Structure formats: C-alpha cells, structure tokens
Amino acid sequence: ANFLVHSSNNFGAILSSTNVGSNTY
Amino acid sequence: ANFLVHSSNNFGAILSSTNVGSNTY
Amino acid sequence: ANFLVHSSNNFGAILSSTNVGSNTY
Amino acid sequence: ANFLVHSSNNFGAILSSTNVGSNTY
Amino acid sequence: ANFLVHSSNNFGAILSSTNVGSNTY
Amino acid sequence: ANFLVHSSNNFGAILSSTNVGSNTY
Amino acid sequence: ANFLVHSSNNFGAILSSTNVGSNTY
Amino acid sequence: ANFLVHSSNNFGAILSSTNVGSNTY
Amino acid sequence: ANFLVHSSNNFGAILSSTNVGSNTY
Amino acid sequence: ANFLVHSSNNFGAILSSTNVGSNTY
Numbered sequence: 001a002n003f004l005v006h007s008s009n010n011f012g013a014i015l016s017s018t019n020v021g022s023n024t025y
Numbered sequence: 026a027n028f029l030v031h032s033s034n035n036f037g038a039i040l041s042s043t044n045v046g047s048n049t050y
Numbered sequence: 051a052n053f054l055v056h057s058s059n060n061f062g063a064i065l066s067s068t069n070v071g072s073n074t075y
Numbered sequence: 076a077n078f079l080v081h082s083s084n085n086f087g088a089i090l091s092s093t094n095v096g097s098n099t100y
Numbered sequence: 101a102n103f104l105v106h107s108s109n110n111f112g113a114i115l116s117s118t119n120v121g122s123n124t125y
Numbered sequence: 126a127n128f129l130v131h132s133s134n135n136f137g138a139i140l141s142s143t144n145v146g147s148n149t150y
Numbered sequence: 151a152n153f154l155v156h157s158s159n160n161f162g163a164i165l166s167s168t169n170v171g172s173n174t175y
Numbered sequence: 176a177n178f179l180v181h182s183s184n185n186f187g188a189i190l191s192s193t194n195v196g197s198n199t200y
Numbered sequence: 201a202n203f204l205v206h207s208s209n210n211f212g213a214i215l216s217s218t219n220v221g222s223n224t225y
Numbered sequence: 226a227n228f229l230v231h232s233s234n235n236f237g238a239i240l241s242s243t244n245v246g247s248n249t250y
Contacts, residue, residue: 005030012038012063012213013236018026019048025209025236030055036238036250037063037088037188038211043051044073050184050211055080059250061213061225062088062113062163063186063237068076069098075159075186080105084225086188086200087113087138088161088212093101094123100134100161109200111163111175113136113187125136126168130155138162138187148169151193155180163187163212173194176218180205188212188237198219201243205230213237223244 001018015025026043040050051068065075076093090100101118115125126143140150151168165175176193190200201218215225226243240250 001026003028007030007032009034010032011034011036011238014030014039015236016028016030016041018042019044021046023048025050026051028053032055032057034059035057036061036213036240038236039055039064040211041053041055041066043067044069046071048073050075051076053078057080057082059084060082061084061086061188061215063211064080064089065186066078066080066091068092069094071096073098075100076101078103082105082107084109085107086111086163086190088186089105089114090161091103091105091116093117094119096121098123100125111138111165113161115136126151128153128166130157130164130166132157132160134159134161136161139164141166142168144169146171148173150175151176153178153191155182155189155191157182157185159184159186161186164189166191167193169194171196173198175200176201178203178216180207180214180216182207182210184209184211186211189214191216192218194219196221198223200225201226203228203241205232205239205241207232207235209234209236211236214239216241217243219244221246223248225250
C-alpha cells in the first residue's frame with residue numbers, strides 16, 4: 001500500500017488505512 | 026491498494042480503507 | 051483497489067472501502 | 076474497484092463499497 | 101466496479117455497492 | 126417543547142420539530 | 151425548548167429543532 | 176434553550192437547534 | 201442558551217446552535 | 226451563553242455556537 005494526502009484546512013481528523021485483522025479506532 | 030485524498034475544510038473525519046478481516050471503527 | 055476523494059466542507063464522515071470478510075464500523 | 080467522490084457540504088456520512096462476504100456497518 | 105458520486109448538502113447517508121454474498125448494513 | 130431521541134444505526138436523517146411559520150427543509 | 155439525544159452509530163445526520171420563521175436546511 | 180447530547184460512534188453529523196429567522200445549513 | 205455535550209468516538213462532526221438570523225454552515 | 230463539553234476520542238470536529246448574523250463554517 002502507498003498513497004498521497006492533500007487537504008486544505010480540514011479541522012476534522014482524516015483516516016485511511018488497510019486492515020487484515022482487528023483494530024480499535 | 027493506493028489512493029489520493031483531496032478536501033476543502035471538511036470538519037468531519039474522512040475514512041477509507043479495505044478490509045479482509047474484522048475491525049472496530 | 052485505488053481511488054480519489056474530493057469534497058467541500060462535508061461535516062459528515064465519508065466512508066468507502068471494499069471488504070471480503072467481517073468488519074465493525 | 077476504483078472510484079471518485081465529489082460532494083458539497085453533505086452533513087451525512089457517505090458510504091460506498093463492494094463486498095463478497097459479511098460486514099457490519 | 102467503478103463510479104462517481106456527486107451531491108449537494110445531503111444530510112442523509114448515501115449507500116451504493118455490489119454484493120455477491122452476505123452483508124449487514 | 127422537549128424530547129428524547131434514541132436510535133440504532135439509522136443511516137437516514139431523522140427530523141422532528143414544531144413550526145408556527147414557514148420553513149424550508 | 152430542552153432535549154436529550156441518544157444514538158448508536160447512526161451514519162445519518164440527525165435533525166431536530168423548532169422554528170417560528172423561515173430556515174434553509 | 177438548554178440540552179444534553181449523548182452518542183456512540185455516530186459517523187454522521189448531528190444537528191439540533193432552534194430558529195426564529197433564516198439560516199443556511 | 202446553555203448545554204452539555206457527551207460523546208464516544210463520533211467520527212462525525214456534531215453541530216448544535218440557535219439562530220435568529222442567517223448563517224452558512 | 227455558557228456550556229460544558231465532554232468527549233471521548235471523537236476523531237470528528239465538534240461544533241456548537243449561537244448566531245444572530247451571518248457566518249461561514
């Protein structure tokens with residue numbers, strides 16, 4: 001996996017991933 | 026998997042992924 | 051899988067993925 | 076699978092995916 | 101599968117996918 | 126007017142109010 | 151007016167108010 | 176007006192208010 | 201106006217207010 | 226206006242206010 005992120009004053013929290021097993025956000 | 030993100034002042038939290046197994050957002 | 055995201059002040063949380071197995075949003 | 080997302084101040088949460096097996100939104 | 105999404109202040113949650121097997125929205 | 130809201134994963138947008146005059150949803 | 155809100159993973163946008171005059175959702 | 180908000184992982188944007196005049200959500 | 205907010209990992213953006221005149225969310 | 230805020234790992238951006246005139250979120 002590989003990626004680019006671009007944003008303009010996003011007050012929110014951006015999330016992006018890939019998962020095969022469990023995780024707790 | 027590979028991706029680009031563009032946004033303009035999104036106060037919300039963006040989410041994008043791919044999963045094969047369990048996960049807890 | 052590969053993708054682009056564009057948005058303008060979406061207060062909501064965007065979600066997009068692909069799954070083969072279980073997941074808990 | 077590959078896609079583009081465009082939106083203008085959607086307070087709601089957008090969802091789009093593809094699934095072969097179970098998932099819990 | 102590939103797609104474009106456009107919307108204007110939809111407070112609701114948009115959903116679109118394709119499935120071959122079970123899923124729980 | 127006073128109220129309680131309870132819901133379980135409603136993807137839709139809930140609306141409830143009271144009005145005396147005009148309004149544009 | 152006074153109120154309580156409870157919800158469990160509603161992806162949608164909840165709305166509740168009271169109005170006497172115009173408004174644009 | 177006075178209120179309490181409780182929620183559990185609502186990805187959507189919650190909205191509640193009261194209005195007497197115009198507004199643009 | 202006075203209020204309390206409680207939430208548990210809401211990825212979305214919560215909004216609550218009161219308005220007498222115009223506003224642009 | 227006076228208020229309390231409590232939250233637990235909300236990745237999203239919380240918003241609450243009161244307005245009499247215009248504003249651009």
